[PDB]
């Protein structure tokens, strides 16, 4: 394979990282244009989501993989900003081209963009740095859960999607701890529901329901029998697995497990837990007994879920039918199958008003991508919300900060006598793609559209007013409720400039060609 260096490896790096940004900047914002993306699997995926694009994107040019990475970083913490850091990369990338074309050295270029990004993220700090509690944040959360859920296509008619998030990070993680638990928040979703169907569950909803509703559909508080024991074949790891074809062993077996499962179920009734959750759950033969025992109990359970039933409920663990004791009883506030008005949607909420260690934010919708649309809605909404519920620090978007950032950077670039005086000012240049593509996403001529914000920032010198992000005709950011976590732009910037900077620091490419995986 071959060594590729300098302008060669430069224009190597330049192609996709620039080229990939294009579909994503056409996808930039809600006015960002969708993309039908079809696998070799026969699949079809219509995505204006760059984070989903990058996921959908298997394309070559390892840098084009590194963006699939870089969006996911900002995807969890900041939420939104997955796509912009990508389209900002290609901006400052081509922006970097002509400085080398000028003769500005590859390590001259990157650092001029880099320290100028410091001013940017520093200038970012001037927009709104506020910090409030959850119950106050919900207003700037839902105003942003407008944008987030909405830039995710229909926040519309939902504070149900908005304000369960206000609870989501809140319950799983503190305000001040700022330790990211979207891992503790269970984002659950079900097709056949509605976007108008969205639910917060501080406990765990287990889709498996009572063996029979003829048996009680309400188990009392706790008294959950934690059981890893077969009431159906427990995929047991030891033996050769064969069913019997003869009536002789057909009768000899059917009397066997009617004895044990009943006295198992009675032993469960004996353990004093009137719900039996069984990590190896219920076939019908045990359920007739279970029904005949009149014991409310749970059929097949996912292996880690009965554990997740433990933690999320604070449930004390009864490991196995051999360990049985009446003392340890799993936690459930109320054990019942939940039909939401969507009856095809039936889960058994283990609903913890006492110990809730996994908060299920459960959203619904008509179909797969719909709930997925609503999930990545509910995902990044809360993710942007998580910033704002922790530190509610808001920049108003759509290029209103860009000029604002590009302004200070530009002059301060000239103020720096270093060669990067150009690069730092060249830095402030490529910031303008943010209103630019958005302008053309919103369907406006950016070059004028953006300097509106400039003329605004020339006057305003802050994101408040802006251009249309939603193509609504009121050119605003604050007032258009274009509200972006001030953390995230600092995130988003630092992500772009530094990833590119190493892309700029790496000029030395051993590949069979310009790009590779």
């Amino acid at each position: 394979k071959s060594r590729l260096m300098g302008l060669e490896a430069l224009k190597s790096h330049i192609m996709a990282a620039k080229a990939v940004a294009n579909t994503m900047r056409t996808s930039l914002g809600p006015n960002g244009l969708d993309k039908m993306m079809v696998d070799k699997d026969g699949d079809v995926t219509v995505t204006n989501d760059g984070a989903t694009i990058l996921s959908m994107m298997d394309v070559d040019h390892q840098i084009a993989k590194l963006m699939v990475e870089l969006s996911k970083s900002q995807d969890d913490e900041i939420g939104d900003g997955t796509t912009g850091v990508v389209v900002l990369a290609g901006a400052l990338l081509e922006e970097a081209e002509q400085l080398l074309d000028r003769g500005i050295h590859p390590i001259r270029i990157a650092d001029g963009y880099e320290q100028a990004a410091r001013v940017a993220i520093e200038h970012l700090d001037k927009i709104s740095d506020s910090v409030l509690v959850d119950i106050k944040d919900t207003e700037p959360l839902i105003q942003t859960a407008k944008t987030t859920l909405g830039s995710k296509v229909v926040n519309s008619c939902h504070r149900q999607m908005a304000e369960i998030a206000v609870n989501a990070v809140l319950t799983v993680a503190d305000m001040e701890r700022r330790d990211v638990d979207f891992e503790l928040i269970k984002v659950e979703g079900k097709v056949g529901g509605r976007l108008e169907d969205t639910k917060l569950i501080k406990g765990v909803i287990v889709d498996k329901d009572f063996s029979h509703p003829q048996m009680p559909k309400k188990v009392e508080d706790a008294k959950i029998a934690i059981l890893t024991c077969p009431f159906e074949p427990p995929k047991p790891k030891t033996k050769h697995k064969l069913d019997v074809t003869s009536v002789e062993d057909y009768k000899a077996l059917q009397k066997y497990e009617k004895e044990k499962f009943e006295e198992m179920i009675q032993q469960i009734k004996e353990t004093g837990a009137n719900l039996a959750i069984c990590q190896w759950g219920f076939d019908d033969e045990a359920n007739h007994l279970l029904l005949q025992n009149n014991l409310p109990a749970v059929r097949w359970v996912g292996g880690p879920e009965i554990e997740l039933i433990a933690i999320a409920t604070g449930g004390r663990i009864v490991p196995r039918f051999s360990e049985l004791t009446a003392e340890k009883l799993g936690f459930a506030g109320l054990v019942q199958e939940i039909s939401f008005g969507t009856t095809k949607d039936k889960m058994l909420v283990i609903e913890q008003c006492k110990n809730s260690r996994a908060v299920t934010i459960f959203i619904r919708g008509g179909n797969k991508m719909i709930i997925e649309e609503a999930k990545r809605s509910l995902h990044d909404a809360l993710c942007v919300i998580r910033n704002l519920i922790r530190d509610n620090r808001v920049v108003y978007g759509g290029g209103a900060a860009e000029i604002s950032c590009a302004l200070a950077v530009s002059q301060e670039a000239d103020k720096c006598p270093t060669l990067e005086q150009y690069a730092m000012r060249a830095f402030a240049d490529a910031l303008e793609v943010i209103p630019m593509a958005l302008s053309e996403n919103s369907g406006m001529n950016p070059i004028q559209t953006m300097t509106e914000v400039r003329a605004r920032q020339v006057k305003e010198m802050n994101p408040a007013l802006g251009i249309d992000c939603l193509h609504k005709g009121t050119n605003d950011m604050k007032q258009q409720h274009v509200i972006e976590t001030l953390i995230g732009k600092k995130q988003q910037i630092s992500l772009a400039t530094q990833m590119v900077r190493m892309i700029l620091k790496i000029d030395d490419i051993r590949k069979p060609g310009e790009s590779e995986e």
Partner: protein, 514 residues
């Protein structure tokens, strides 16, 4: 058949083979010294600023490329630093004798004369060399912070070196007596903040496995008896493939509840081994952790062997072949165990490791792709801070002496010649190309800067040098840009013979052909 070739066509191809390779490391090695993403396999994409690694990564299609690897790699094992430059110097003469080889003019003394030339420097290198240890403070761990500061500053963050340089000293202290990456072994963190690290001088575990409750399962031991276990406990344990027939009758519940129990033994033999903090490279199982969280002895599964080994070297402990732990040294043991989340991730930290010779670092970066460059400052500094420990005699870093030597040497190009002023001149100049590259891979000027140093090398000043960040004339040791003498000494002697070796070779035989 067999292949062979001789003489200038081979001999120039001999030197043609080499000069191709030294450009891989060319602009590399430094803060503005470039960095190499080298992809030698389809899904295998590798990044190094060091030659030896990519030398190990790249294919060597030439005896030259073969003969080169160790030569640069020779400077690798020494300081941890300097392969790229040795690669530069090896073929740096090869262009100077291309006049001679295209003159066809080669008495072999050309390589033989560069040797005493290699002698006059490595001699002079140690002459001007000065012990930093007994010279600096009475202390010599702020000296190390000086080295740490300077050696945290030559690749990435000088921002955090004000904070980090004192810890680089502290790591080296526990590093020194056993010189290891694992015992400075860093645990990256992110999201709790951006761009910071802190030294933790006991060991740390990035991984662990706990379910069936966690916040209800004890996460800490104020006297951990540390089981360092490679053992595995799965959903059900099996000593048999099969006997009789999933359903039948007596056979159904017979297998299942015992499949439960065969776990309980290993589940027990862990817990009565004095394993309270339990550590198993192979995962603890769920029902195992249902058991383990039932027994309220903290388990761990999916555990790093290094974490297991960092402990066994910090505790004087041992990784264990048996769930039963008879010996507290076959066991690990500390006076502190915690599962604490720095950044939010479950970690198992051991302080109270009786040896505790493994320093761990909990490090945050700026972004995804910005983090690597940060800790290499931490890793480099230690290596060269330790390198400042190992050879206390230390000169100006950043190629300060070469220009002086380049002068000092071709000073003999006035003194030496009946002939070899050429050789002494050509020998003298190739020194400068390494920092000149560092000058030039900074995109900045060297003949400008380096000659200005030389003008004051014409003063007789030697440690006069460049600070690669500022990229301007200076005195590196007064900037305290540092390398011990032996660093400069070997790189020459490494690349010198390399420049000498294949020039004795006009001919290469290949039996396999090609």
């Amino acid at each position: 058949g067999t292949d062979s070739s001789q003489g200038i066509p081979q001999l120039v191809s001999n030197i043609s083979a080499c000069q191709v390779i030294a450009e891989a490391v060319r602009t590399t090695l430094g803060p503005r010294g470039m960095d190499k993403l080298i992809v030698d396999g389809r899904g295998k994409a590798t990044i190094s600023n060091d030659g030896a690694t990519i030398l190990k990564l790249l294919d060597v299609v030439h005896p030259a490329a073969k003969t080169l690897v160790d030569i640069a790699k020779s400077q690798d094992a020494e300081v941890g630093d300097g392969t790229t430059s040795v690669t530069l110097l090896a073929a740096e003469f090869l262009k100077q004798v291309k006049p001679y080889v295209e003159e066809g003019l080669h008495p072999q003394i050309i390589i033989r004369a560069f040797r005493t030339a290699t002698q006059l420097a490595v001699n002079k290198i140690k002459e001007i060399a000065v012990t930093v240890k007994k010279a600096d403070k009475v202390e010599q761990r702020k000296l190390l912070e000086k080295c740490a500061m300077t050696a945290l500053s030559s690749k990435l963050i000088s921002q955090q070196k004000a904070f980090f340089a004192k810890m680089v000293v502290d790591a080296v202290m526990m590093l020194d007596d056993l010189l290891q990456l694992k015992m400075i072994g860093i645990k990256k963190v992110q999201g709790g903040a951006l761009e910071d690290s802190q030294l933790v001088a006991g060991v740390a575990f990035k991984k662990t496995f706990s379910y069936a409750g966690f916040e209800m399962q004890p996460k800490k031991y104020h006297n951990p008896k540390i089981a360092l276990l490679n053992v595995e406990l799965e959903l059900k344990a099996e000593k048999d493939n099969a006997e009789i027939r999933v359903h039948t009758v007596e056979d159904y519940q017979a297998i299942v509840d015992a499949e439960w129990n065969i776990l309980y033994d290993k589940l027990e033999k862990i817990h009565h081994s004095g394993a309270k903090v339990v550590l198993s490279k192979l995962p603890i199982g769920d029902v195992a952790t249902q058991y383990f969280a039932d027994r309220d002895m903290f388990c761990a599964g999916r555990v790093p062997e290094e974490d297991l080994k960092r402990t066994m070297m910090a505790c004087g402990g041992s990784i264990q072949t048996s769930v039963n732990a008879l010996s507290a040294d076959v066991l690990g043991r500390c006076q502190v165990f915690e599962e604490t989340q720095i950044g939010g991730e479950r970690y198992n930290f051991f302080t109270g490791c009786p040896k505790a010779k493994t320093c761990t670092f909990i490090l945050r970066g700026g972004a995804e792709q910005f983090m690597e460059e940060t800790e290499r400052s931490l890793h480099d500094a230690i290596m060269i801070v330790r390198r400042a420990i190992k050879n206390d005699s230390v000169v100006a870093g950043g190629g300060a002496i070469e220009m002086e030597l380049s002068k000092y040497l071709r000073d003999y190009s006035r003194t030496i010649p009946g002939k070899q002023q050429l050789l002494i001149g050509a020998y003298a100049k190739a020194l400068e190309i390494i920092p000149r590259q560092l000058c030039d891979n900074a995109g900045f000027d060297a003949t400008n800067i380096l000659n200005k140093l030389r003008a004051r090398h014409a003063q007789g000043g030697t440690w006069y040098g460049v600070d690669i960040n500022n990229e301007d004339i200076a005195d590196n040791f007064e900037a305290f840009v540092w390398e011990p003498a032996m660093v400069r000494i070997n790189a020459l002697t490494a690349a010198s013979e390399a420049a000498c070796l294949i020039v004795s070779v006009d001919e290469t035989i290949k039996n396999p052909r090609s």
